[PDB]
């Protein structure tokens, strides 16, 4: 209370290093008991927080004056007392972290950050080691992980988990400098040895996903983090050891106990948040091809081959080793599910490189574009917009496949004999298209003799931009290509945001006079 | 007379008047013209053999 604040100010203004330690121990016992009592029961509106604020300022001044070091003549009271007081206050802050069913913005964060900064200053001031608070980072991450959620445990809408203390920690301490993430990732591996707590510490991984997956690391040059407290245990410049322990702890957590949403997200951004930061990112390839051959009839587990393709292509670009019989698998993988997935753009931004090959056949590209035409029969306009320039690019730079879209044996040309045009008539009477959709091999099906009616019928469409991007086959091929990665990130809300305004002068009357027939 | 490598053939060379060597996919197949028949095939690769 206010009397505790006055006693703390008096015991900090006077040194008196017996009764000051006794009054600090009494106020610390009162602070721990009031924390366990008014922890969201009679919710502590800055009461224990103000007590810990006064105790943190007093312990900061006392640590700047005299802390546990080499003694004058065996100071078995003051140095041990300040050490026990600091340890008990940090353990009480960790206890308030581990027992917190609510969060009024200061349930554990202020006390934990104050004790962490005070431990860093105490290590760098006593100078007996270099960042020796990383041993207490074990119980720190144990508390900030065991700060369990009531109902926000891996919500099925966004992210992979929603833990306020973990996201505020990775905002305010874990990514404001550079070495404590390295020491955390090593001490996570030195944590995960006995099964007793790691059976809980491998339960729900999405909190660590939101904790580490931020693209702010030291091995990533996009945002380099600055210098920590001035006692270096060669920590930031040991990126190689950082990469190896990163790889080891990542494989140990990825071994078991997946949730489906966290599995989907970690497969969605495995290619960039995980792959380039390893010491030897080859230990993930069989996991990635198991995700690629993961074909269940479950409707959620069908996005799994789509998210695996980026990591698999990163692997094959890094060093050539294959998944065999590639293109009939890539043939069978696309369907209206794949066209109505959220990741049309993220799929086509790898489909263009996978289909820009030199060795593939006219048979393969013919089967691809005709089954894709039967696919784009049934699509939204945001799928027509992304599917038409890719197929135009492929039919342009594989110009033998124009035999589908054009046939010169069936032209209504004037200058030939009535015998020849009657032979044209009986040929267009007895002609049969040999296509079949259910054949899954591209070169074995008959897609060449079967023409492409589907985009010709897709010209007739209720959107003039789809009309002007669908008459490109009736018009000639004077234009080279269209900019897929500057063309493809368009959803329905972005499309309406695009044509909410334009060169705007549009008005027309309503003279239908068709009201009193069926007005519903 | 035609000879059908089941994979799309990538290279056709001749090593003799009798037998030729054609490759497509992850195996190369030796054909003989006098027997008009495939008689060897080795597939000790990963991806398609290209020359």
């Amino acid at each position: 209370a206010k009397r505790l604040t006055a006693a703390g100010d008096r015991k900090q203004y006077n040194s008196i290093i017996k009764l000051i330690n006794e009054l600090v121990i009494p106020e610390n016992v009162t602070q721990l008991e009031e924390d366990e009592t008014e922890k969201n029961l009679r919710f502590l509106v800055m009461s224990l927080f103000q007590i810990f604020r006064k105790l943190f300022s007093r312990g900061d001044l006392t640590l700047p004056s005299s802390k546990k070091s080499t003694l004058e003549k065996e100071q078995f009271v003051n140095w041990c007392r300040k050490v026990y007081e600091a340890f008990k206050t940090k353990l009480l802050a960790i206890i308030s972290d581990i027992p917190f069913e609510t969060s009024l913005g200061l349930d554990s964060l202020d006390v934990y950050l104050q004790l962490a900064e005070l431990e860093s200053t105490h290590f760098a001031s006593e100078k007996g080691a270099p960042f020796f608070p990383n041993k207490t980072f074990r119980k720190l991450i144990i508390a900030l992980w065991s700060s369990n959620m009531g109902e926000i445990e891996d919500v099925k809408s966004s992210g992979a988990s929603e833990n306020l203390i973990i996201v505020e920690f990775t905002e305010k301490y874990y990514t404001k400098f550079a070495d404590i993430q390295y020491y955390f990732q090593s001490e996570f591996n030195q944590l995960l040895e006995d099964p007793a707590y790691q059976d809980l510490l491998l339960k729900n991984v999405g909190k660590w996903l939101a904790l580490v997956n931020h693209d702010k690391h030291c091995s990533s040059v996009d945002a380099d983090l600055e210098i920590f407290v001035p006692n270096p245990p060669q920590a930031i410049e040991n990126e190689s050891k950082f990469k190896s322990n990163f790889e080891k702890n990542w494989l140990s957590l990825l071994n078991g106990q997946l949730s489906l949403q966290q599995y989907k997200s970690i497969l969605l951004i495995l290619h960039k948040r995980i792959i380039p930061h390893f010491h030897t990112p080859t230990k993930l390839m069989d996991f990635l091809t198991d995700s690629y051959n993961l074909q269940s009839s479950n409707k959620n587990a069908g996005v799994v081959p789509i998210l695996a393709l980026n990591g698999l292509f990163e692997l094959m670009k890094r060093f050539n080793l294959e998944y065999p019989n590639f293109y009939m698998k890539l043939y069978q993988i696309i369907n209206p599910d794949l066209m109505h997935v959220k990741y049309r753009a993220r799929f086509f931004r790898l489909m263009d490189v996978f289909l820009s090959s030199t060795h593939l056949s006219a048979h393969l590209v013919a089967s691809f574009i005709k089954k894709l035409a039967r696919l784009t029969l049934e699509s939204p306009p945001s799928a027509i917009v992304t599917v038409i320039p890719f197929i135009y690019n492929l039919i342009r730079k594989h110009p033998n496949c124009m035999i589908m879209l054009h046939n010169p044996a069936f032209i209504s040309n004037p200058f030939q004999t009535p015998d020849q045009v009657a032979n044209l008539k009986t040929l267009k009477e007895n002609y049969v298209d040999p296509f079949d959709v259910h054949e899954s091999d591209p070169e074995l099906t008959h897609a060449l003799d079967s023409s492409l009616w589907e985009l010709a019928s897709l010209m007739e469409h209720y959107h003039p931009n789809v009309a002007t991007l669908a008459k490109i086959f009736a018009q000639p091929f004077k234009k080279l290509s269209y900019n897929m990665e500057d063309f493809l990130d368009w959803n329905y809300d972005s499309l309406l945001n695009a044509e909410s305004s334009r060169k705007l002068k549009t008005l027309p009357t309503l003279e239908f006079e068709a009201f009193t027939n069926v007005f519903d | 007379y035609s000879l059908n490598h089941d994979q799309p053939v990538e290279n056709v060379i001749a090593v003799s008047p009798t037998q030729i060597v054609s490759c497509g996919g992850n195996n190369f197949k030796v054909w003989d013209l006098t027997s008009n028949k495939k008689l060897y095939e080795r597939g000790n690769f990963n991806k398609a053999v290209t020359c």
Partner: peptide, 17 residues
């Protein structure tokens, strides 16, 4: 869902090919 282990053996398979 696969429930065996995620670690690397088809690299050994097509490195033994």
């Amino acid at each position: 869902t696969a429930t065996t282990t995620g670690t690397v053996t088809v690299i050994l398979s097509q490195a033994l090919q």
